Amino acid sequence: ISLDQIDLLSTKSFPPCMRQLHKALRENHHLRHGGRMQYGLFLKGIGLTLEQALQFWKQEFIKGKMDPDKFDKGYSYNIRHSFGYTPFSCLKIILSNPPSQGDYHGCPFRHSDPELLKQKLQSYKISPGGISQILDLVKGTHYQVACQKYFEMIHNVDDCGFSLNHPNQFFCESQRIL
Numbered sequence: 001i002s003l004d005q006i007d008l009l010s011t012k013s014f015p016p017c018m019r020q021l022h023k024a025l026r027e028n029h030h031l032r033h034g035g036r037m038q039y040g041l042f043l044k045g046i047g048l049t050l051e052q053a054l055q056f057w058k059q060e061f062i063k064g065k066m067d068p069d070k071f072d073k074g075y076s077y078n079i080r081h082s083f084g085y086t087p088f089s090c091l092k093i094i095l096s097n098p099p100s101q102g103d104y105h106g107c108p109f110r111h112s113d114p115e116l117l118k119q120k121l122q123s124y125k126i127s128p129g130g131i132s133q134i135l136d137l138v139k140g141t142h143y144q145v146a147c148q149k150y151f152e153m154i155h156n157v158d159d160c161g162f163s164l165n166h167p168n169q170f171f172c173e174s175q176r177i178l
């Protein structure tokens, strides 16, 4: 809800796919369509207004030396239209629009190859036990469960107490705790 708290929320309440998108956006001051879509709708879902969204996406896109006016002429329409599509679910994310080079959207558990997923989780300081467990699930295609496991670890609880199927559900479940 607070535009200047997104950096921290990334760390605690965003599932790995949205945390990645927020990261990629802050470092590259830009995201391709796949991710503007996934992360954009997700931010809407967590309750950002249309005013904050434009100020969020415009502000970051300008840090990339992008002509402020070019932004309104080539981006802002879709932000605004978004606020009058449905936030992506895990299956939609897992099953559609497979990320390519330069893309950062998708499901980390389903789209990152095993070794890169490992490194990523290691950068999030997940225990070596937890990382091993996730690698077992992922090999079995139990993506959403690996994500629940990740949820349980960064929250320090034994059972998330919910069957995951939506990035926004993860953020909610998360917020109910912290």
Ligand code: SF4
Binding pocket: 015, 016, 017, 018, 089, 090, 091, 093, 094, 106, 107, 108, 109, 110, 143, 144, 147, 165, 166, 167, 170
């Ligand atoms: S499992 Fe669902 S939420 Fe967890 S990352 Fe993959 S997509 Fe995002």
